[PDB]
Amino acid sequence: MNPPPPETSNPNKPKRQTNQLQYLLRVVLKTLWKHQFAWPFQQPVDAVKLNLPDYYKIIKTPMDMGTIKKRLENNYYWNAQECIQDFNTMFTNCYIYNKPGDDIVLMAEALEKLFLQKINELPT
Ligand SMILES: Cc1nnc2ccc(N3CCC(C)CC3)nn12
Ligand code: NA
């Protein structure tokens, strides 16, 4: 079955708009989003649709770019590192649930390299 997706709002959580978080939405996320390999990551993994009944029996901190995009648009993060950690969790989840050489893993590897290329230099 599917668990509920990660939260994109939390009224008690402190939030910030920074130049780096603006950039993570305008440049980093919106560039990755258009990549030919982005589509499996644009929404939470649907274990019922995709017939992966063990996905959430294995993956305990799910993350995806649709959640990340909604968090950025909702001003959910305190700083850029928090959002970067969500991207890293998304990539590592894919490596954990699958194995080397899988098509989905090749996709994640390419996106992760583009991601790191984009956050190598951030605005001040
Ligand atoms: C996201 C994600 N993380 N692990 C997986 C395993 C499979 C999967 N799908 C099947 C094939 C893929 C090209 C698209 C959907 N997605 N997936
Ligand atoms: Na950059």
Residue numbers in the entry: 43 to 166
From the paper:
While substitution of only the piperidine group at R1 (13) showed no blocking activities, but surprisingly, introducing 4-methylpiperidine restored inhibitory efficacy. The N1 nitrogen atom of the triazole of the core scaffold forms hydrogen bonds with Asn140. The compound 14 contains a piperidine group at the R2 position of the scaffold instead of indole, which does not interact with Asp145 and Ile146 to form hydrophobic interactions but still interacts with Trp81 and Pro82. Two hydrophobic interactions between the core scaffold and Leu94 and the core scaffold and Tyr139 are common features in 5, 6, and 12. These hydrophobic interactions are not found in 14. The compound 14 showed a retained conserved water with the WPF motif, but these water molecules did not participate in water-mediated ligand binding. The compound 14, the smallest compound in this study, showed that the surfaces of the compound and binding position of BD1 were electrostatically complementary as well.
